[PDB]
DNA sequence: ACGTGCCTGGAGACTAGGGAGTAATCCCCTTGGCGGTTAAAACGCGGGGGACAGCGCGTACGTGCGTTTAAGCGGTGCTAGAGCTGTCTACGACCAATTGAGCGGCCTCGGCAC
DNA sequence: GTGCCGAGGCCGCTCAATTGGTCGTAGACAGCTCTAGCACCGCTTAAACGCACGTACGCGCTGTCCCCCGCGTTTTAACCGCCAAGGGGATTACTCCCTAGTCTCCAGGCACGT
């Protein structure tokens, strides 16, 4: 597990979010594994865009403004 | 009375993918009222060609890593190391593709 | 019920994800921003998955609900079709 | 009940391109997802193409135009060639 | 002796309902037609997908409601669902 | 003999055509069957969205001392409302000005 | 016809950039913008010509362009009739 | 509506020159060219908005080819 | 990883009908030419705003290490709910007759530009 | 105060929406099964965490020079109007051939066993 996101905390976070949409919801294990895989892919792609924004400002340290710029150019809702 | 030996439409077209299943899927899916005779054959040929291309590049990746089997990492490498397949399958997330 | 579990994605996990994306150095203010971004993304996906589940009269979220919710974002996911 | 899948046809194509290579079950699942995704993309594009021209029938001409719209560059040329070859052989074969 | 259909008269009726003294140009009429058409195809396609996911052959008001929830954001979705439910209730109560 | 014909839009209290919406749903290759309440629901939703956009655009035109809605006012209404902008953000309005 | 991308003049690019909020423009921006526009137009026109060829037509119509743009994820209102 | 001139005749010549590499003896409806021009306007204005965002990030006021390249790379457009 | 039974989806043959291919016609809308005349672009110049390299400082990040925390695993049990089968009834498709809604062409004069 | 044109109102017709009746079947609901999601517990050990510390790097400041902007002048080519030609899109009518549907048969693909 190179990109180790731990199972139990992620499952608890997934359950917490779903409580705001429907009460007493169940989850298959494969549904949580799909959510975790999507989260990994999304975050790796966003960190790649963030690193391009940092290099463009002649930096090696990624900063929150880089993430904001990448997400704005992508068109993601702030 | 004397029915000839049944010949699959896949064998008539020289294909490995099932023409009859592709025809049934086209009819069932509410894509159009009617489906022509050659549309399932064309679709099955295209699908088989794309499958062959991806499996060839995944086998090359498996061979370059000295493994005798294809794993999802080899499919991810094959997709991302070809310009056309990256253009076709760039927005796609492969399970276990990055990490094994 | 336990809440504030977004802290469950730890700083070393974010560091590992960022190093796989090519990042060499990470500011200390990146982690909270990353947690917020992940929360927003997860909220959108889980909202559409729960809508798909509620339509089907079910009480359990399946892998196909997540796949359908992700697809209609434009984030197709392979390997959960069966 | 009985889920139909492309595993045996993908395995036949694999033994044609790499006769000594195998494939894991997870890779077969990714290949199944890929085949389904491509089938639904092409069929949807062909269905839209038929409706634009006020037609009721999806023929090989709609499939060819869908392949040219969806596949990029070199991929479209070879897919079109393979489809035309299959249709010609099927038409000759009684 | 031929026709092509559009939503111009209904958009005009709604416009007179909301802004009695305001008019609309033909260019804006074309924009409104394109908008209505686009939203119709979006909702119809989502409803068709929803019916296919559940192995159903009938598109009902439940499919339309779920599609509207999927496609429209936030308060727009909440108000549209309220309007659709109100209209369906009024329709079914009648005769 | 039969009763006087009443349009379904009048029955549902709508301005949009329920019968035209039903015909388009049946023609469109969306499903094998179409329920009775589906066209009513769809017409109600379309009428609501049209009313929202025309309200905002009429407000925008009024703020310009103009009594007639032009594509510029529709563009302003779409881009000045957060919900409409999220719904209609990837859309180009002809002659609307790209801001 | 060979050199027509130069018909997108430097003042036109300056106007488009000003409308997008740009205050100062480097002198190397114009060739890059012309190349970007050429790529975009090539993609759109290729898909529109495919649509036209499917219909046995010789004239590209506004609906072909609207369909080509729609499948890029760029939706153009006001040319459907 | 707030005029933003791309001249019709050079753009038409450009569209005809581009299209002749896909099919010879092609006609263009006038509304097709108008739609293409409107799409080009919108696309370029939005790209310059992203380019100006990228230029400010580097503490500049002058947009440069590298800003366009970064904006298009983040957008996902092919180089 | 290969052999085997069976059972369900594919293939064969025939018929009816309507979808689509083809020919003919017309009229409309795209393409080309020519002249003038004017708005827009191209060009040169001068100045100053801004891009960029160099430098110093101080602060915050990466690394290492000992300690703490809680995740993972295996086992057990419970019980909700998903998937399947069977029945029956309401509901939507289909057809035929009726009629009013809606579309196109014409007439008018108002909100804007000059 | 005057002139423009485009948007609003009116009428005839015609075709698509409405109403009524019939009937086949899709789906709603009940009952059952048995799977898999959830909760608890104890133990281990991997991973996170908290602190210290050195140094790489972010950021502010300064100075130079280059190259963009604004302005005035000349050029050039878009554009509008008018005319002509002709290609080709849209419509209609006829025909024939291709696809749906039904019934029969069987062979390929999947669960079980070895």
**Residue H4 backbone zone (phi > 0: left; psi -120 to 50: alpha; other: beta):** beta
CB D17 within 8 A of CB B61: no
Query: Which residue(s) pair with D22 in the sheet?
Result: B69
Token reading at D43: 């069929």
CA–C1' gap, F69 and I111, in angstroms: 13
Q: Do D29 and C76 touch (CB under 8 A)?
A: no
**Residue C74 backbone zone (phi > 0: left; psi -120 to 50: alpha; other: beta):** left
Token reading at H35: 């739609």
| Whole-angstrom distance, CA of residue F1 vs CA of residue B25 | 47
Per residue, the 3-state secondary structure of A22-66, as one string, reads CCCCEECHHHHHHHHHHHHHHHHHHHHHHHHHHHHCCCCEECHHH
> For residue B67, which phi and psi values (nearest 5 degrees)?
-90, 150
Nearest to F83 by CA among F43, F42, F55: F55
Looking at domain B8-100, which CATH architecture does it have? Answer: Orthogonal Bundle (1.10)
Domain residue limits, chain B: 8-100
3-state secondary structure of H46: helix
DSSP E58-87: EE-HHHHHHHHHHHS-HHHHHHHHHHHHHH
Residues in chain D with CB shorter than 8 Å from the CB of G51 are 52
Query: Which residue(s) pair with D23 in the sheet?
Result: B70
Residue with token string 């997870």: D26
Domain G2-81 has CATH 3.40.50.1000: no
User: Exposure of E55 by Cβ count < 10 A (0-12 exposed, 13-18 middle, 19+ buried)?
Assistant: exposed
CB A5 within 8 A of CB C14: no
Q: Residue E82: which residues within 8 A CB-CB, separation 6 or more?
A: none
H12 CB neighbour count, 10 Å cutoff: 17
3-state secondary structure of F6: coil
| Whole-angstrom distance, CA of residue A38 vs CA of residue A15 | 16
Q: How many domains is chain E partitioned into structurally?
A: 1
**DSSP class of D43:** H
| Whole-angstrom distance, CA of residue E1 vs CA of residue D85 | 46
- Which segments of H1-79 are extended strands (E)? 27-28, 62-63
CB A59 under 7 Å to nucleic chain J: yes
| Positions 26-55 in B, CB within 7 angstroms of strand I | 34
Token reading at D19: 């006769």
Nearest to H12 by CA among G51, G11, G7: G7
What is the bridge-based pairing of β-strands G75-77 and F91-93? parallel
CATH of region C3-82: 1.10.20.10
Total CB pairs under 8 A between chain D and F: 3
Token reading at C80: 């959960």
CB B98 under 7 Å to nucleic chain I: no
DSSP C22-70: T--EE-TTHHHHHHHHHHHHHHHHHHHHHHHHHHTT-SEE-HHHHHHHH
> For residue D6, which phi and psi values (nearest 5 degrees)?
-100, 20
CB G60 within 8 A of CB H28: yes
> For residue G75, which phi and psi values (nearest 5 degrees)?
-110, 125
**Strand I positions closer than 7 A to protein CB:** 1, 8-13, 19-21, 29-31, 40-42, 50-52, 60-62, 70-72, 80-85, 91-93, 98-104, 111-112
Nearest to G67 by CA among E38, E26, F68, H5: E38
Q: How many Cα atoms occupy the beta-carbon half-sphere of B46 within 13 Å?
A: 32
CB B39 within 8 A of CB D60: yes
Nucleotide nearest to H10 (CA to C1'): J78
- H or E element: which one contains H63? strand H62-63
Nucleotide nearest to B22 (CA to C1'): I10
Residue with token string 């209209």: E87
Alpha-carbon distances of E24 from A46, E12, E93, F52, rounded to whole Å: 44, 8, 35, 15
Nearest to B42 by CA among B73, B3, B15: B15
Q: Residue D58: which residues within 8 A CB-CB, separation 6 or more?
A: B26, B31, B32, B34, B35, B36, B39, D43, D46, D47, D50
Q: b/e per residue, H23-55, with b = 16+ CB within 10 A?
A: eeebebeebbbbbbbbbbbbbbbbbbbbbbbbb
- H or E element: which one contains D89? helix D74-92
Please tell me the experimental approach by which this structure was elucidated: cryo-EM
DSSP chain B: --PPPP--HHHHHT-SS-HHHHHHHHHHTTS-SEE-SHHHHHHHHHHHHHHHHHHHHHHHHHHHTT-SEE-HHHHHHHHHTSHHHHHHSTT-EETTTTT-
Nearest CB neighbour to D3, from listed C76, C79, C82: C82
CB H61 within 8 A of CB H55: yes
Q: Do G67 and D52 touch (CB under 8 A)?
A: yes
| Whole-angstrom distance, CA of residue F45 vs CA of residue C2 | 39
CB C9 within 8 A of CB C39: no
Resolution to 1 decimal place, in Å: 2.7
Query: Which residue(s) pair with G77 in the sheet?
Result: F93
**Residue H47 backbone zone (phi > 0: left; psi -120 to 50: alpha; other: beta):** alpha
User: Exposure of F66 by Cβ count < 10 A (0-12 exposed, 13-18 middle, 19+ buried)?
Assistant: middle
Structural domains for chain H: 8-75 (1.10.20.10)
| Whole-angstrom distance, CA of residue G2 vs CA of residue G13 | 20
Token reading at C37: 């971004």
Alpha helices in G1-81 (DSSP H): 10-19, 29-54, 62-70
CB H20 within 8 A of CB H26: yes
Alpha-carbon distances of A18 from A12, A24, C54, E42, E70, rounded to whole Å: 10, 9, 12, 26, 16
| Whole-angstrom distance, CA of residue G51 vs CA of residue H72 | 27
> For residue E58, which phi and psi values (nearest 5 degrees)?
-120, 135
| Whole-angstrom distance, CA of residue G12 vs CA of residue G33 | 11
Domain F7-99 has CATH 3.40.50.1260: no
Q: Residue G39: which residues within 8 A CB-CB, separation 6 or more?
A: H77, H78
Instruction: Output the domain CATH number for residue E25.
Output: 1.10.20.10
Identify the contact set of chain D against chain G, taking CB-CB distances under 8 A. 49, 52-53, 61-62, 65, 68-69
Token reading at D46: 């062909």
> For residue A32, which phi and psi values (nearest 5 degrees)?
-70, -35
**DSSP class of D84:** H
CB D30 within 8 A of CB D42: no
Residues in chain F with CB shorter than 8 Å from the CB of B30 are 29-32
CB C10 under 7 Å to nucleic chain J: yes
| Whole-angstrom distance, CA of residue B30 vs CA of residue D58 | 11
CB B49 within 8 A of CB D77: no
**Chain B residues 76-95 with CB within 8 Å of chain A:** 93, 95
Write out the residue range of the structural domain in which residue D60 sits.
Answer: 1-94
Q: Do E27 and F37 touch (CB under 8 A)?
A: no
């Amino acid at each position: 597990t190179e990109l180790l996101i731990r199972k139990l905390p992620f499952q608890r976070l997934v359950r917490e979010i779903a409580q705001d949409f429907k009460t007493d919801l169940r989850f298959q294990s494969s549904a949580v594994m799909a959510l975790q895989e999507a989260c990994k892919a999304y975050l790796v792609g966003l960190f790649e865009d963030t690193n391009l924004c940092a290099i463009h400002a002649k930096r090696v340290t990624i900063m929150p403004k880089d993430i904001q710029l990448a997400r704005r150019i992508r068109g993601e809702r702030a | 009375k004397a029915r000839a030996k049944a010949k699959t439409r896949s064998s008539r077209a020289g294909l490995q993918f099932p023409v009859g299943r592709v025809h049934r899927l086209l009819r069932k899916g509410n894509y159009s009222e009617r489906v022509g005779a050659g549309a399932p054959v064309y679709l099955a040929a295209v699908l088989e060609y794309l499958t062959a291309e991806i499996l060839e590049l995944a086998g090359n990746a498996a061979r370059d890593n000295k493994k005798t089997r294809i794993i999802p990492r080899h499919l991810q490498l094959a997709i991302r190391n070809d310009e056309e397949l990256n253009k076709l399958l760039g927005r796609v997330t492969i399970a276990q593709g990055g990490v094994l | 019920v336990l809440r504030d579990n977004i802290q469950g994605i730890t700083k070393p996990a974010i560091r590992r994800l960022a190093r796989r994306g090519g990042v060499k150095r990470i500011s200390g203010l990146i982690y909270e921003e990353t947690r917020g971004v992940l929360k927003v993304f997860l909220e959108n996906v889980i909202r559409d998955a729960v809508t798909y589940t509620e339509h089907a009269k079910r009480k359990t979220v399946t892998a196909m609900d997540v796949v359908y919710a992700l697809k209609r974002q434009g984030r197709t996911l392979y390997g959960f079709g069966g | 009940s009985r889920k139909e899948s492309y595993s045996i046809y993908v395995y036949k194509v694999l033994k044609q391109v790499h006769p000594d290579t195998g494939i894991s079950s997870k890779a077969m699942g990714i290949m199944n997802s890929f085949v389904n995704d491509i089938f639904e993309r092409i069929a949807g594009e062909a269905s839209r193409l038929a409706h634009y021209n006020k037609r009721s029938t999806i023929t090989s001409r709609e499939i060819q135009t869908a392949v040219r719209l969806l596949l990029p560059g070199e991929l479209a040329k070879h897919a079109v060639s393979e489809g035309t070859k299959a249709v010609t052989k099927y038409t000759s074969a009684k």
